[PDB]
Amino acid sequence: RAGRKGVDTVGESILICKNSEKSKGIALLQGSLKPVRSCLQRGEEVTGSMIRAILEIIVGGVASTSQDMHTYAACTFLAASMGAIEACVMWLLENEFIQSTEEGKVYHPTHLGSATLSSSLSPADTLDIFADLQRAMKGFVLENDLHILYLVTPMFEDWTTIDWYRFFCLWEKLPTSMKRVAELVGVEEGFLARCVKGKVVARTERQHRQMAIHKRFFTSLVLLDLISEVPLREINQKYGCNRGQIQSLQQSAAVYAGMITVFSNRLGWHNMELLLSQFQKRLTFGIQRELCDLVRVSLLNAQRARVLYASGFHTVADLARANIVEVEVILKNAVPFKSARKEAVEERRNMRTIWVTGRKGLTEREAAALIVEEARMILQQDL
Amino acid sequence: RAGRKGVDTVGESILICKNSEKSKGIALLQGSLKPVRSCLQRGEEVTGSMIRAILEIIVGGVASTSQDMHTYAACTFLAASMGAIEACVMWLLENEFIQSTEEGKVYHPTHLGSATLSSSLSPADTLDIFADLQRAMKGFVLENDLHILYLVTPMFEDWTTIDWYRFFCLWEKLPTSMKRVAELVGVEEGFLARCVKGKVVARTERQHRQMAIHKRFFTSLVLLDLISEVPLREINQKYGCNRGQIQSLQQSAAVYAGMITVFSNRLGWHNMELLLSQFQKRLTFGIQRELCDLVRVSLLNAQRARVLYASGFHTVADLARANIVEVEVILKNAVPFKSARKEAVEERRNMRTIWVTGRKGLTEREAAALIVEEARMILQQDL
Ligand SMILES: [K+]
Ligand SMILES: [K+]
C-alpha cells in the first residue's frame, strides 16, 4: 500500500526493529509467499472440505453413481498437483445424510441431506445442531427470548475475549427465569467457578465442548440485550467488549438465524421454525418487534426507529403521512452528546451530517424528506 | 502345557494349518517374545499410568517437592532403558487433584486427591465419575434401585456383545419408572434406533461416549434383575449373554460399588454414600436386602439363602436353632432338574455332591450340619 499510482514518485516502506529482532526483519524483506495448499489434503482419511464437497454434488443431483464421484476427484485442485473419496461417501451414509440403492450403487439425498444443502450449513456442524434442536424441543422455555436466541447463537469462532470474573458476577445477578435456561442447556455453576478461580482453558480434550457451551450462553446474553435495545455503551461496560466485536457478532447471528430457520423448515419442524423466523430481522438491526415495520425504510436504523416510535410514528403508514420538518426534529433529538444536550447557528443549514452506503452527504433535512418519500413509495408497494 | 513332569516321556504340540496359512504357522514355531515395553512411554506428553503414579506418591506423602519427582523418575522402568514428569504435575494442578504452595514449589493433596487414592480409582476416570455424581445429586430417582445401580455400573471394558435389536424390544416394554431414569442419564431413543436399523458403531469421535452410556444403561438393567433374584437362564434369554459374562460382571460391579462408596465418603457426600453402601453386598451374591444376613454363612449363596428364607429361616439366629436334617431337606429342594422334579436310592448317602473353595467333597447332610454349626459360631460372635 506504499505508492499512489499517478501521485507519488516512489513508495517507501520502513520496518522498525531492534538488534535482537534484526534477523527476523530481513527474513520478511527477502521472504516470498508459500505455495498454495489444497485444503482437501488427507491420519485423516476423511476431511470436512471433502465431505461438504461430496454432499453438494449428490444432493444437488449432478453426481449419482460411484463413477461420477471419482470423475469429480479429477477436477479438484488436489488432483492437479499430480481412496479418500470413498471414505466420505460412507460417512454420509453412516450419518443419514445420503441413501444407497443397490443400477448398482446409486446415491440419493435424504431429507437431512437436502436440508443441509438448503441451509448452507457444514455437514460436520449439522450433526451437533440437529441434536441440539431435538434436545430443545423436548423441553423449551418460552417465557423469555433467551432460549430461542441460544439456538441461533453462533459459536464456530471467538468474537471476543471473555472476562470470566465479569461473567460470574452477571451469573449471580441473573434472574431465575434465565438461570433455568442456563441449566437446561449445560451451563454448570461449578465450571464457571473453575474459570474465574483458575485461568485453565483446557480445551485439549474433544469432549471439552463444555467450554463452547459457556461461551455460547455468554454470547446469547449479549444478543438478548442487543435485541432489547440496550445501548452499545452499556453492553460494552457490562460484558467487556467493544462495539466492533458486537456488530461483527450480530451480522453473523442474523445470517446464522436464517440458516437454522431454513433447516427447520425443510425437516418439517413447523413449531420450531415459527419461533425462529422472527429473530433474523431483530438480530440484524438490534430492535424489538415493534420497530420491525419502521426499519424497512433504508435510512431508519435501531436508534432512529425508536425515537420515531416514541413520538407517534409506529408504522410506515404513519410515517408516510408525516410532516417532513417534524421527522427532521425527532431525528435531531436522537443525537448523542457528551454533555446533557438532548446559540443559534444558521450556517449549519448545509452541513452534510448523515452518512449512507454509496453515499452523498445528506443534511438532516434532506434525510428526513428521503425517509418520508421512501415511506410513501413503500406504502404503495404494500397494496 | 504339553508334558507332565514326572509322568510323560515327551510333550507333543501340533498346530493344524492349511497350505495358505502354512507360512504363518512356521512363524509361530520359530517366533520369540517381544521386548517388554514400559507402558509409561511418551504426541502424548501426558499419559494415564504416569499421572496415576505421580498422584500416588504425592497424596501418600512420600513426594512433596519437585526434586522428589525426578528422583522417582529415575526409579522407573522407563528410565532403566537409558520433561514428561513436569507435565503430569501441572495436570494434577489444573484438575484440582493437587495443591501448590510457593519452601519454593511444594505439592500437597486436595480432598479430591485423597479421595481418589483411597478409592483405588484412576485419575482419568475420576473426572467423569465426579461429574456424573454431581449430576445425579441434582435430580435423582429413588422409587426404584435402577438409578443407584447406574452409578455403580462399570463401563471400562466390554463384558458382552450386546444385541441392539433385543435392546430396543426391552426398551418399549420398559416401564415408565425406568424410562424416566434412562432419559435422566442420556439414553435417547433416537440413538437406539440408529443402532438397530444400521450397525454403525462409530465411536471414532471422542465425544462418542454416547455409545458407552447406552451400553452402561443396558448393563444396569442386567444388574437390576440380578439383585432382584431373577434366574440366570431368564437373564440369558432376555439379554443374550452367557452365565460366564454375568458372573464376571457382578464381581466387577461389586468391587466398583465399594470404590464409589469410599469416594463419596471422603468427599463428605453422606446422603449419596448412604444409598450406595448397600449394593456392594447385593451385587456380590445377587440377592435382595432380606437375604443379606443369611449370606454371611460361607456355604449359603443366593439360591440356598432364598429357599431357606421361604421356609421360615430368615436370619442366622433362626438358622442356629435349626434342626440339621430340616436344613438338609430344604437344600435338596433347591436343586435344578430338567424334568419337573422339585425310586429310593440309599446308595447315595455318601455321594459328595456339594462343592466348596479349597474343597473336600461335602454330602448334602455334612453341608447342612456345617451351615448350622457356622451359624451358631457367628451368632456368638454377634454378641
Ligand atoms: K434500514
Ligand atoms: K456365602
**CA-closest candidate to residue B164, choices B192, B200, B131, B206:** B192
Burial of A246 (0-12, 13-18, 19+ CB in 10 A): buried
Q: Which neighbouring-strand residues pair with B185? A: none
> By what method was this entry solved?
X-ray
Whether B206 and A202 lie within 8 Å, measured CB to CB: no
Concatenate the DSSP letters of all residues of B91-134 into one string: HHHHTTSEEEE---SEEEE-HHHHHHHHTT--HHHHHHHHHHHH
After which residue numbers is chain A interrupted with C–N beyond 2.5 angstroms? Answer: 42, 82, 102, 342
A335 Cβ contact partners less than 8 Å away, ≥ 6 residues apart: A341, A342
Helix A164-172 to helix A232-239 angle (10° resolution) is: 100
**B12: buried, middle or exposed (CB in 10 Å: 19+, 13-18, 0-12)?**
exposed
Residue B331 and residue B368 in contact, taking contact as beta carbons nearer than 8 Å: yes
Beta-carbon contacts of A73 under 8 Å, excluding residues fewer than 6 positions away, are A79, A85
The answer to whether residue B94 neighbours chain A at the CB level (below 8 Å) is yes
What chain A residue is nearest to B203 in terms of C-alpha separation?
A94
- How close, in Å, is residue B8 to chain A by CA atoms? 53
Report how far ligand 1's centroid is from the alpha carbon of A122 (Å): 30
User: How many A/B residue pairs have CB atoms within 8 Å?
Assistant: 18
CB-based contact B327:B368 (threshold 8 Å)? yes
In eight-state DSSP terms, residue B240 is -
| Distance in Å, alpha carbon of B101 to nearest chain A alpha carbon | 15
Contact B94 A200 (CB under 8 A): yes
The CA B297 to ligand 2 mean position distance, Å, reads 5
DSSP classification of residue B5: T
- Rounded distance, CA B92 to CA B205, Å? 25
Q: Which residues fall within 8 angstroms of residue B190, CB to CB, at 6 or more apart?
A: A134
B221 neighbors B170 (Cβ within 8 angstroms): yes
**Residues B182, B217: contact at Cβ < 8 Å?**
yes
Inter-chain touch B190–A96, beta carbons under 8 Å? no
Q: How far apart are CA A199 and CA A33, in angstroms?
A: 37
CA distance A31 to chain B (A): 31
Of B96, B198, B209, the CB nearest to A207: B209
CA distance A367 to A352: 10
Spatial CA neighbour of B105 closest among B72, B58, B45, B46: B58
Three cell numbers at B143? 422409587
**Cα dist from B79 to A327, B39, B55, B71, whole Å:** 82, 12, 19, 11
- Would you say B352 and B363 are in contact if contact means Cβ atoms under 8 Å apart? yes
Ligand 2 centroid – CA B355 distance (Å): 12
**Any A CB within 8 A of B205 CB:** yes
Q: How many CB atoms lie within 10 A of CB B217?
A: 23
Would you call A362 helix, strand, or coil by DSSP? strand
A124 Cα: distance to centroid of ligand 1 (angstroms): 35
Resolution, in Å, please? 2.9
Distance CA A233, CA B38 (A): 59
Touching check for B194 and chain A: CB below 8 Å?
yes
Distance of CA A302 to the CA centre of its chain: 18
Residues of A in contact with B94 (CB under 8 A): 198, 200, 202
Distance CA A353, CA A10 (A): 36
Cα–Cα distance, A252 to A378 (Å, whole number): 28
Give Cα separations from B2 to A34, B7, B225, B356 (angstroms): 66, 11, 43, 29
Say if CB A334 and CB A375 are below 8 A apart. Answer: no
Residue type, A352: R
- Burial of residue A252, with CB atoms counted within 10 A of its CB: 0-12 exposed, 13-18 middle, 19 or more buried: middle
Nearest-by-Cβ selection for B202 from A94, A190, A194:
A94
What is the grid cell recorded at B185? 442419564
How far is CA A174 from its chain centroid? Answer: 25
Count of alpha carbons within 13 Å of B364, Cβ hemisphere only? 16
Put simply, the answer to whether B206 touches A207 (Cβ < 8 Å) is yes
CA separation for the pair A88, A85 (Å, rounded)? 5
Of the candidates A134, A144, A219, the one whose C-alpha atom is nearest the C-alpha of residue A176 is A144
Q: Say how many Å lie between the CA of residue B315 and the centre of ligand 2.
A: 14
- Check if the beta carbon of residue B40 is closer than 8 Å to that of residue B78: yes
Whole-angstrom distance, CA of residue A328 vs CA of residue A348: 14
